Amino acid sequence: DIQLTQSPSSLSASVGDRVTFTCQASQDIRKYLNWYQQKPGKAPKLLIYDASNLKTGVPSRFSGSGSGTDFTFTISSLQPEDVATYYCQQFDDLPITFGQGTRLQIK
Amino acid sequence: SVALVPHVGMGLETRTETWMSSEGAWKHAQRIETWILRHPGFTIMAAILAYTIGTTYFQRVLIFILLTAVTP
Amino acid sequence: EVQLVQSGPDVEKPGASVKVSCKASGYTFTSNYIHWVRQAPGQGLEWMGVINPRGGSTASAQKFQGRITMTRDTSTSTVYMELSSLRSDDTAVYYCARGGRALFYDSYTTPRDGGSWWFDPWGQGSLVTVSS
Amino acid sequence: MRCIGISNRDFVEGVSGGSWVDIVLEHGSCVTTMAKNKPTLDFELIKTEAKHPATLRKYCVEAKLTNTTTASRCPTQGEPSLNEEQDKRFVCKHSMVDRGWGNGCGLFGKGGIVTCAMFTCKKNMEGKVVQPENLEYTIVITPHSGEENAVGNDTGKHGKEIKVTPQSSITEAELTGYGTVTMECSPRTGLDFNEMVLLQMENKAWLVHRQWFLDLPLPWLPGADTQGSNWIQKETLVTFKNPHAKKQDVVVLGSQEGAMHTALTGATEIQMSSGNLLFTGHLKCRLRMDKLQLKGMSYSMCTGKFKVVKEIAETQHGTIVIRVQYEGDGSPCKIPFEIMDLEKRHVLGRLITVNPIVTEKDSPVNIEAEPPFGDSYIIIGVEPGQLKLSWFKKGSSIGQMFETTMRGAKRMAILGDTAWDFGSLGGVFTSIGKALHQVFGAIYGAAFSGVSWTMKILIGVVITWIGMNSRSTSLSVSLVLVGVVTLYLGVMVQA
Amino acid sequence: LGRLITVNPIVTEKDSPVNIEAEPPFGDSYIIIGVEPGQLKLSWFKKGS
Numbered sequence: 001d002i003q004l005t006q007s008p009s010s011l012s013a014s015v016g017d018r019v020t021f022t023c024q025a026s027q028d029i030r031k032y033l034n035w036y037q038q039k040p041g042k043a044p045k046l047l048i049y050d051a052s053n054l055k056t057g058v059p060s061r062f063s064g065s066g067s068g069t070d071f072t073f074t075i076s077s078l079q080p081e082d083v084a085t086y087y088c089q090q091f092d093d094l095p096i097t098f099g100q101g102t103r104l105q106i107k
Numbered sequence: 108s109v110a111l112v113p114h115v116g117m118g119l120e121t122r123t124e125t126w127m128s129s130e131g132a133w134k135h136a137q138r139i140e141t142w143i144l145r146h147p148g149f150t151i152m153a154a155i156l157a158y159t160i161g162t163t164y165f166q167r168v169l170i171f172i173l174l175t176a177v178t179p
Numbered sequence: 180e181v182q183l184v185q186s187g188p189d190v191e192k193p194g195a196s197v198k199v200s201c202k203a204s205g206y207t208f209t210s211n212y213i214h215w216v217r218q219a220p221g222q223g224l225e226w227m228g229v230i231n232p233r234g235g236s237t238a239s240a241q242k243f244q245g246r247i248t249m250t251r252d253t254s255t256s257t258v259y260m261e262l263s264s265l266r267s268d269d270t271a272v273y274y275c276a277r278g279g280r281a282l283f284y285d286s287y288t289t290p291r292d293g294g295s296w297w298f299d300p301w302g303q304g305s306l307v308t309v310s311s
Numbered sequence: 312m313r314c315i316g317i318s319n320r321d322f323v324e325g326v327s328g329g330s331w332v333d334i335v336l337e338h339g340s341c342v343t344t345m346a347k348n349k350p351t352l353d354f355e356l357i358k359t360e361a362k363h364p365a366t367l368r369k370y371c372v373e374a375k376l377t378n379t380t381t382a383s384r385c386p387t388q389g390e391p392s393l394n395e396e397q398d399k400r401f402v403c404k405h406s407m408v409d410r411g412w413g414n415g416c417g418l419f420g421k422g423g424i425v426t427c428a429m430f431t432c433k434k435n436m437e438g439k440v441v442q443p444e445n446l447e448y449t450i451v452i453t454p455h456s457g458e459e460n461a462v463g464n465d466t467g468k469h470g471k472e473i474k475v476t477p478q479s480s481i482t483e484a485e486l487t488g489y490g491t492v493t494m495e496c497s498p499r500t501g502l503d504f505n506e507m508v509l510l511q512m513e514n515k516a517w518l519v520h521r522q523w524f525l526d527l528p529l530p531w532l533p534g535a536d537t538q539g540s541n542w543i544q545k546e547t548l549v550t551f552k553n554p555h556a557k558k559q560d561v562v563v564l565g566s567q568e569g570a571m572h573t574a575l576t577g578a579t580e581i582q583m584s585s586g587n588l589l590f591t592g593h594l595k596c597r598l599r600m601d602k603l604q605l606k607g608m609s610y611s612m613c614t615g616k617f618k619v620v621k622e623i624a625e626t627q628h629g630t631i632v633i634r635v636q637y638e639g640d641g642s643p644c645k646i647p648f649e650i651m652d653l654e655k656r657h658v659l660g661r662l663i664t665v666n667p668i669v670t671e672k673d674s675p676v677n678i679e680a681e682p683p684f685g686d687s688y689i690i691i692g693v694e695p696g697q698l699k700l701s702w703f704k705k706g707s708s709i710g711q712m713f714e715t716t717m718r719g720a721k722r723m724a725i726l727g728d729t730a731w732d733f734g735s736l737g738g739v740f741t742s743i744g745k746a747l748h749q750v751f752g753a754i755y756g757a758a759f760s761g762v763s764w765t766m767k768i769l770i771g772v773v774i775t776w777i778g779m780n781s782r783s784t785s786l787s788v789s790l791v792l793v794g795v796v797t798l799y800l801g802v803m804v805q806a
Numbered sequence: 807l808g809r810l811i812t813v814n815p816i817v818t819e820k821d822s823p824v825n826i827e828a829e830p831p832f833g834d835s836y837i838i839i840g841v842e843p844g845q846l847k848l849s850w851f852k853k854g855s
């Protein structure tokens with residue numbers, strides 16, 4: 001039921017850029033959000049749990065912020081191994097819903 | 108079924124009218140009056156029983172109105 | 180190490196039922212929940228349901244009302260998902276992650292947060308194709 | 312304002328104790344408060360929202376049957392078995408019919424028989440519960456003193472829309488300038504959740520208490536279904552025909568949606584489409600008001616030449632409103648409003664706008680006030696006495712006191728000991744009345760409840776007769792107390 | 807009027823969710839933890855007797 005809109009749907013940027021993603025929820029999900037990368041046809045990897053925390057083993061160029069319903073994911077320096085489909089995901093209330101996705105293209 | 112136990116004196120009221128808005132009360136009264144009107148013989152039998160047992164007048168009236176209301 | 184292994188890809192008939200395994204390694208198998216997530220190729224991710232290894236309660240989403248069954252084997256530390264009434268929309272890649280565990284049972288949300296949904300321990304992926 | 316013509320409105324006098332006033336407010340009515348300063352605020356309650364429910368139960372309302380297996384063994388050897396009795400998804404029943412050599416078996420007895428049917432379900436009751444958190448009350452608090460666009464229109468941004476939750480506190484709200492108002496809600500003494508069940512049918516929902524909802528027929532199913540359909544009931548639904556001797560058969564009992572609605576009469580309804588939009592129910596604020604100017608004293612008595620642009624407009628026992636249009640060079644000033652008597656001046660009314668004020672220029676400011684029960688001259692001009700208006704509040708003093716007594720009886724009715732908290736600054740008497748009525752209504756709690764309109768008025772008249780029979784002056788605490796509370800409760804309930 | 811059964815509760819090094827148990831009386835109660843801007847009150851109603 002709880003919807004999750006992910007914006008924008010696709011981006012292109014050059015190597016070293018700073019890119020931000022925005023996810024909006026129809027309900028209050030106060031901290032329950034997760035950010036994932038997915039390399040296409042590969043085994044994917046968690047980036048951010050609790051919408052603010054790095055996983056150990058993830059490099060420090062990734063970050064996330066936001067509290068109420070609007071959440072911002074941020075890559076400080078875009079690197080050529082970071083071309084992936086990026087997802088944001090609610091954890092609250094359990095008809096567990098993903099974002100639509102965000103594809104990246106290297107310039 | 109859920110034809111009965113019609114959630115009546117449970118509490119939980121408010122300022123506003125609840126579901127049937129004073130139509131269920133008149134529903135109850137009109138259907139028991141209609142059932143009395145269709146079956147007069149049981150009413151006469153209840154009146155005879157009220158006159159026989161009890162025999163103080165208030166007790167008679169009480170058990171007569173009860174035996175009119177004992178119908179399911 | 181911290182690892183899960185799934186079964187190989189399968190192709191089944193419409194209206195049949197398919198069974199996908201999810202074997203665990205590297206930890207105590209009753210210290211995490213197991214959760215199943217699908218992904219159609221022309222779509223993002225979609226959650227299917229939840230099993231607990233300790234004990235064995237399950238639940239699922241409303242889109243899979245009465246179509247999905249989840250069992251396990253504690254001795255082999257393995258979780259089985261069985262999807263029934265297969266149609267062409269079920270052709271997807273299947274995933275089985277783990278959750279941080281409200282000790283006893285189910286898909287709790289108040290104990291902090293599950294913590295991934297589902298890409299830390301998850302496995303290698305099970306492609307299921309419904310065709311004639 | 313936002314509170315005119317919404318009658319059953321809760322006037323509140325007194326602020327003493329420093330600033331705290333106890334207000335009990337609900338979705339239906341709204342509350343207007345007053346003090347010797349600190350201008351009159353209006354407390355309208357709007358939607359309640361319980362954010363995170365949890366699903367506890369599924370009742371099936373319509374069902375269908377299929378695959379219809381049946382079996383019978385023999386006359387008194389064997390009681391019949393069937394392999395599709397193994398699933399609890401099938402409904403099964405044993406019976407005894409008859410058997411003989413016409414049927415083929417032998418021994419000519421009354422042999423047993425089974426019947427079985429697969430149970431598939433149509434649209435359901437999706438009953439949910441909520442904890443006494445994850446729920447917010449939204450209160451619009453709005454001030455008086457001018458600003459045309461409509462002494463009604465609760466839609467619109469003049470009163471602030473402050474939220475409150477039991478995870479929150481003293482409820483600081485800000486207004487234009489003066490209105491720093493602190494509200495300390497006690498939402499846990501409200502509807503008393505963990506005794507509530509929200510009940511969703513196809514489009515609607517209802518608020519019914521928990522024991523009734525558990526006790527109800529129309530098959531059980533717990534919240535963890537998904538791939539279940541494990542309905543542990545069905546003696547209340549699907550019925551099995553058995554004619555005189557031979558073969559028995561299965562019968563769907565049909566949709567009980569109408570019977571469901573007839574069951575949940577006497578229960579409040581609720582729209583529940585977007586998460587939740589919970590309605591009618593009350594809550595209890597304590598109100599602190601220090602932090603309040605009068606929107607400027609800081610002015611002058613104005614020049615003159617006002618102009619009415621609206622009628623006399625009496626609302627609901629005295630509250631009369633007048634919309635004046637200042638004409639002149641005001642540089643916004645006060646409005647010299649008075650409610651006077653006739654000549655040899657005996658000025659006696661009250662103004663509930665306190666310190667009304669003109670805005671920047673021509674803008675039709677409006678003023679509400681309460682005259683006495685008879686003739687009155689409402690005057691607004693000063694130097695050429697500019698404008699008087701005659702008004703006759705029909706009224707009474709005794710009728711006003713009796714209607715206030717009826718309001719107090721309705722507060723001894725529907726809203727409970729919170730209505731003993733509905734006043735303020737009572738100290739000894741109000742607190743001891745609340746505790747006494749607490750234990751008294753607890754003894755008349757469950758404790759003689761659960762009864763309908765008719766049976767309550769009948770038990771009232773029989774207990775008032777047995778009090779009228781007058782033994783040893785127990786007839787008071789009998790007859791007069793019990794007859795008053797039973798009749799004035801019975802004719803007012805089932806609203 | 808209550809009692810605290812944690813006696814002298816204490817914060818650890820930094821952000822770490824410390825937890826406190828206590829016993830209110832049988833009715834209304836305001837459990838308070840902040841000080842200088844009165845930081846946080848909570849209402850609670852132990853039903854009891």
Ligand SMILES: *[C@@H]1O[C@H](CO)[C@@H](O[C@@H]2O[C@H](CO)[C@@H](O)[C@H](O)[C@H]2NC(C)=O)[C@H](O)[C@H]1NC(C)=O
Binds near residue numbers: 460466468
């Ligand atoms: C209730 O309040 C609304 C919001 O102020 C009023 O709508 C305004 O009406 C005035 C009248 O000229 C317009 O100038 C505003 O632009 C309106 N505001 C809007 C559309 O947001 C509404 O008229 C009020 N109700 C009544 C009955 O007057």
Ligand SMILES: *[C@@H]1O[C@H](CO)[C@@H](O)[C@H](O)[C@H]1NC(C)=O
Binds near residue numbers: 377378
């Ligand atoms: C019930 O009957 C239908 C057709 O008559 C059949 O397709 C279905 O499999 C049957 N159900 C079971 C449980 O065998």
